[PDB]
Curated annotation (Swiss-Prot), chain B:
Organism per entry: Zika virus (ZIKV)
Task of the protein: Displays three enzymatic activities: serine protease, NTPase and RNA helicase. NS3 serine protease, in association with NS2B, performs its autocleavage and cleaves the polyprotein at dibasic sites in the cytoplasm: C-prM, NS2A-NS2B, NS2B-NS3, NS3-NS4A, NS4A-2K and NS4B-NS5. NS3 RNA helicase binds RNA and unwinds dsRNA in the 3' to 5' direction. Leads to translation arrest when expressed ex vivo. Disrupts host centrosome organization in a CEP63-dependent manner to degrade host TBK1 and inhibits innate immune response. Inhibits the integrated stress response (ISR) in the infected cell.
Subcellular location: Host cytoplasm; Host endoplasmic reticulum membrane
All residue ranges annotated as the Peptidase S7 domain in the record: 1-154
Membrane topology: Peripheral membrane protein
Active site, per annotation: H36, D60, S120
Post-translational modification: Acetylated by host KAT5. Acetylation modulates NS3 RNA-binding and unwinding activities and plays an important positive role for viral replication.
Subunit architecture: Forms a heterodimer with NS2B. Interacts with NS4B. Interacts with unphosphorylated RNA-directed RNA polymerase NS5; this interaction stimulates RNA-directed RNA polymerase NS5 guanylyltransferase activity. Interacts with non-structural protein 2A. Interacts with host SHFL; this interaction promotes NS3 degradation via a lysosome-dependent pathway. Interacts with host CEP63; this interaction disorganizes the centrosome and inhibits host innate immune response.
Coiled coil (residue ranges): none
Protein name: Serine protease NS3
């Protein structure tokens, strides 16, 4: 059985850790909701 | 049960101990998560029950108690924040500049941040704190790193 527990407020935080790149990828989305790289 | 706006963990007791299977957003009395997190099953919030209201396997989204309320969109230029809620760990904000998923039906923002599977459903925010989509449905690229779509209800 599944249950939910509160984890926090939804807010933008000044001076959060900044990371991750910005890749531009050609993708396909199938009927099952799965993305695949073309 | 608890109806306060905010980010929530989605837990199960069917496996060993208490296991976090995902994350969701409560806004305007409606709970929002990814379809693959719950498979459309009912949820519990203390003594109260949340029944599914709308779902779509192709968008990989589901809402509980009412229709999908998250309508903000990525502006295509600015950095955003993933409000990651990892299993057994505190809610943490991560700022990133999204990349793009280019499809035959249009472009979608994408965030190149890697988190455990149980982090699926964590919200992505704009600078006003508005939820522009949910993290947790994407691809593994030519390196082995994970890239998630910014999935918003359509
Ligand atoms: C008549 N309605 C009831 C259920 N419904 C939603 O819950 C919904 C609303 C807006 C969205 F962006 C979305 F992804 C889903 C759509 C049809």
């Amino acid at each position: 059985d599944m249950y939910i527990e509160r984890a926090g407020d939804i807010t933008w935080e000044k001076d959060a850790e900044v990371t991750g790149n910005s890749p531009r990828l050609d993708v396909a989305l199938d009927e099952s909701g799965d993305f695949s790289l073309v | 049960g608890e109806t306060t706006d905010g980010v929530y963990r989605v837990m199960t007791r069917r496996l060993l101990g208490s296991t976090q299977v995902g994350v969701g957003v409560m806004q305007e009395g409606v709970f929002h998560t990814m379809w693959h997190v719950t498979k459309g099953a009912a949820l519990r919030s203390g003594e109260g029950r949340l029944d599914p209201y709308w779902g779509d396997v192709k968008q990989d989204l589901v809402s509980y108690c009412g229709p999908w309320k998250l309508d903000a969109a990525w502006d295509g230029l600015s950095e955003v924040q993933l409000l990651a809620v990892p299993p057994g760990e505190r809610a943490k904000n991560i700022q990133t500049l999204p990349g793009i998923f280019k499809t035959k039906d249009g472009d979608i923002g994408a965030v190149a941040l890697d988190y455990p599977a149980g982090t699926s459903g964590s919200p992505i925010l704009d600078k006003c704190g508005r939820v522009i989509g949910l993290y947790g449905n994407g691809v593994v690229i030519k390196n082995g790193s994970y890239v998630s779509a910014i999935t918003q209800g359509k």
